[PDB]
């Protein structure tokens, strides 16, 4: 019976491959062949944020495109005013081992998590004037690798126990569990409508999950190593994954297979973070070679390099209005680029 | 100045946050970072109990005006290479292994836990992140190994062992096998201590090893090393 189930599974996988091949007549390199190239992209460092003393592991911008939050291994979650480099807040974390942080769309709450397997939500707007631990979510048996706010009360997180989770914050209970990944889920991205979300794990696969239904929609397998980053296209009909095989890959949800590959022979190091520009034409990816490349998402040709960090670029984000791109590295510095 | 009154007050608040961060960093930099590692039932529990007497578990204690933090990853059931780099820069790595494991095969199967501990030690010591971090090797359960070696010879673990079935010689052999797994002979040093269930010199040995590491790091900083 087990062998019959395995042969049914492999027949189904072959059917998936055949169906994907059938709906593949012209590549993205052929559709976007006569379009004008983006050209050389010159982005300069406008602000440098100092105050972190250990390697910085994550950051998130926020909807207002002015504030930002950064988490560092020195046990500090610092909320910066990017326009004036002022430190709006400095939260001392209970556990110094933080690897992810999220800033709520409303801005009233901020999230973090890490090796303590607990997602801590802090209330920034308190009548006491300080920042207090609003809630601690527990239940993941592995390290918390990513977290993203749906709203003030719902949060989606990914953990190293091959599991994603949707939590109701006021109750503190794990509302929904997303399972199916066979490797540690390293990053997740939320769709613009906050109805679906993609999660990339260490099994070299990405999965699309329906938030409301709680079940996986599609699985995309094009990478050859652990996927460290993921990010939707601005229209929510495609996404990009960076992995350890020194390649980025643009997949799309509605055709259900890979569209484009972003790789160069002179790059051997893996990708730590990716994000899309406001129009989606530029894909920014941070690498382990201390640099940050900017690729043409439509032509796959590299457009620029953001080389200003002295250590591994660990986190990278783009504002909602797209005005600037912020990169934080292991040298305890964030840099804003325009 | 073009700043408003509220802007100047915000800048003053930022400067206060800056000096508080500097004070916190000064306090934290005066503290020893120890990463506790080992196989299953290696003896990490008795080690942390001894240090207390004199996700991730943090153990803070004091000895000779030094503050020590041990980070026992322990029950972190995830493949290690995605978060081991978080521990790069620790003062030392305390690697605990049980001697009596030399003839025990229930690893999870049909292979010695001793060899699994050897492979874990090889992975940690020769890791790309811990090229200069020093290892403090703890060989626990010496008292029970004393009586176990008299019935099951060491050849159950090492087929090439030819020495006498004596505690000192076989223990030296095991220490030599662990030290040979070090490929960074020039950048890092391995400190070995032979501990038991009822000894109180373990914290003194950790103090000595940390002091030696501090001296070596200072010599590197001065350029004299």
């Amino acid at each position: 019976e087990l062998d019959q189930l395995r042969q049914e599974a492999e027949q189904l996988k072959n059917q998936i491959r055949d169906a994907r091949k059938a709906c593949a007549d012209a590549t993205l390199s052929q559709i976007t062949n006569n379009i004008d190239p983006v050209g050389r992209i010159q982005m300069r460092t406008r602000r440098t944020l100092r105050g972190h003393l250990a390697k910085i592991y994550a950051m998130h911008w926020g909807t207002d495109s002015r504030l930002l939050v950064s988490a560092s291994q020195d046990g500090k979650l610092i909320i910066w005013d990017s326009y004036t480099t002022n430190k709006v807040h400095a939260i001392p974390l209970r556990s110094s081992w933080v690897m992810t942080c999220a800033y709520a769309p409303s801005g009233n709450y901020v999230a973090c998590g890490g090796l303590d397997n607990i997602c801590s939500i802090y209330n920034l707007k308190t009548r006491e004037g300080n920042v207090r631990v609003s809630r601690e979510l527990a239940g993941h048996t592995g390290y918390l690798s990513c977290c993203r706010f749906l709203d003030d009360n719902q949060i989606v997180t990914s953990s190293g126990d091959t599991t994603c989770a949707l939590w109701d914050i006021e109750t503190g209970q794990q509302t929904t569990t997303f399972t199916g990944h066979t490797g540690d889920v390293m990053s997740l991205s939320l769709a613009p409508d906050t109805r679906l979300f993609v999660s990339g794990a260490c099994d070299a696969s990405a999965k699309l999950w329906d938030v409301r239904e709680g079940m996986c929609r599609q699985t995309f397998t094009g990478h050859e190593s652990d996927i460290n980053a993921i990010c939707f296209f601005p229209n929510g009909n495609a996404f990009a994954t960076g992995s350890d095989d020194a390649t980025c890959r643009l997949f799309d949800l509605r055709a259900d297979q890979e569209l484009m590959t972003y790789s160069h022979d002179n790059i051997i190091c893996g990708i730590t973070s990716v994000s899309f520009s406001k129009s989606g034409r530029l894909l920014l990816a941070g690498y382990d070679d201390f640099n940050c490349n900017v690729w043409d998402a439509l032509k796959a040709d590299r457009a620029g390099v953001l080389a200003g960090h002295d250590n591994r670029v660990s986190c990278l984000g783009v504002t909602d209005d797209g005005m600037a791109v912020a990169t934080g590295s292991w040298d305890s510095f964030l840099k804003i680029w325009n | 100045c073009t700043l408003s009154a509220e802007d100047k007050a915000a800048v003053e608040r930022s400067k206060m946050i800056d000096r508080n961060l500097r004070e916190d960093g000064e306090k934290a930099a005066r503290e020893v970072k120890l990463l506790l590692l080992g196989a299953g039932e290696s003896g990490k529990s008795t080690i942390v109990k001894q240090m207390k007497i004199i996700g991730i578990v943090e153990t803070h204690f004091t000895f000779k005006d030094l503050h020590f933090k041990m980070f026992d990853v322990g029950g972190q059931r995830s493949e290690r290479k995605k978060w081991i780099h978080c521990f790069e820069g620790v003062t030392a790595i305390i690697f605990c292994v049980a001697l009596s494991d030399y003839d025990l095969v229930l690893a999870e199967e049909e292979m010695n836990r001793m060899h699994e501990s050897m492979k874990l030690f090889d992975s940690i010591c020769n890791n790309k992140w811990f090229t200069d971090t020093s290892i403090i090797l703890f060989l626990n359960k010496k008292d029970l190994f004393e009586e176990k070696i008299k019935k099951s010879p060491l050849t159950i673990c090492y087929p090439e062992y030819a020495g006498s079935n004596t505690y000192e010689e076989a223990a030296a052999y095991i220490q030599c096998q662990f030290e040979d797994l070090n490929k960074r002979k020039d950048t890092k040093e391995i400190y070995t201590h032979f501990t038991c269930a009822t000894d109180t010199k373990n914290v003194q040995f950790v103090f000595d090893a940390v002091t030696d590491v501090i001296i070596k790091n200072n010599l590197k900083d001065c350029g004299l090393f």
Epitope: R66 | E12, R13
Partner: single-chain antibody
């Protein structure tokens, strides 16, 4: 909740000295700047003194500079005002006001109950509230106007205008900060608008508890000045 108590007021002979203590509870006193504000018996508010968090910066009004000294003891969460050479014009209700300053913050958030002091017997922005009082009817719409001698709009785009309401027998309560934002706990009936040197505060479907004196404050140039106030009365 957060609460401030002022103590140390009473009958004082002219030229004497007096000590006022404001005790704070329910909030992080060390991280809040503190203001001493004065209201004469039949007059409006008048900013007196300010001490920042950590006592880094200290400011006084010109009428009280030199004689008055503002200080704070953070471990005891208390604020001190030492007054020397008291004049007959210093008799008033004194309020200690908490005020935190960061991006998006709401300064002058909470006001103390105030303590009564009874002394026995230029180049600053003038904020003008031309109308002394208006009669209103519950359920109607009323607009309170304000005018400034100098434009309150800064190069950063913020218009530093603050609106306060002082119900009879109670301390002033913040309604609008920076001319647009609504303070926490304030009903959405109050709306703040204006531009440059002209400002207005509009109340939609005013209720019975909206009766009081509305004060207009500026925060651009630091010698804070208040408006004369506009009293609302029922018919």
């Amino acid at each position: 909740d957060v609460q401030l108590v002022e103590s140390g007021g009473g009958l004082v002979q002219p030229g004497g000295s007096r000590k006022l203590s404001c005790s704070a509870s329910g909030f992080a006193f060390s991280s809040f700047g503190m203001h001493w504000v004065r209201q004469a018996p039949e007059k409006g508010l008048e900013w007196v003194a300010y001490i920042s968090s950590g006592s880094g910066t200290i400011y006084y009004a010109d009428t009280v500079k030199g004689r008055f000294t503002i200080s704070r003891d953070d471990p005891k969460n208390t604020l001190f005002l030492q007054m020397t050479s008291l004049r007959s014009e210093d008799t008033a209700m004194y309020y200690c006001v908490r005020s935190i300053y960061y991006y998006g913050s709401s300064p002058f958030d909470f006001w103390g109950q105030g303590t009564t002091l009874t002394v026995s017997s230029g180049s600053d922005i003038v904020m003008t509230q031309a109308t002394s009082s208006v009669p209103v009817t519950p359920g109607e719409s009323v607009s309170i106007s304000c005018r400034s001698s100098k434009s309150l709009l800064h190069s950063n785009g913020n218009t530093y205008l603050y609106w306060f309401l002082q119900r009879p027998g109670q301390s002033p309560q913040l309604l609008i900060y920076r001319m647009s934002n609504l303070a926490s706990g304030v009903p959405d009936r109050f709306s703040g608008s204006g531009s440059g040197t002209a400002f207005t505060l509009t109340i939609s479907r005013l209720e019975a508890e909206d009766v009081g004196v509305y004060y207009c404050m500026q925060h651009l140039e630091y010698p804070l000045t208040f408006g004369a106030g506009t009293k609302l009365e029922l018919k």
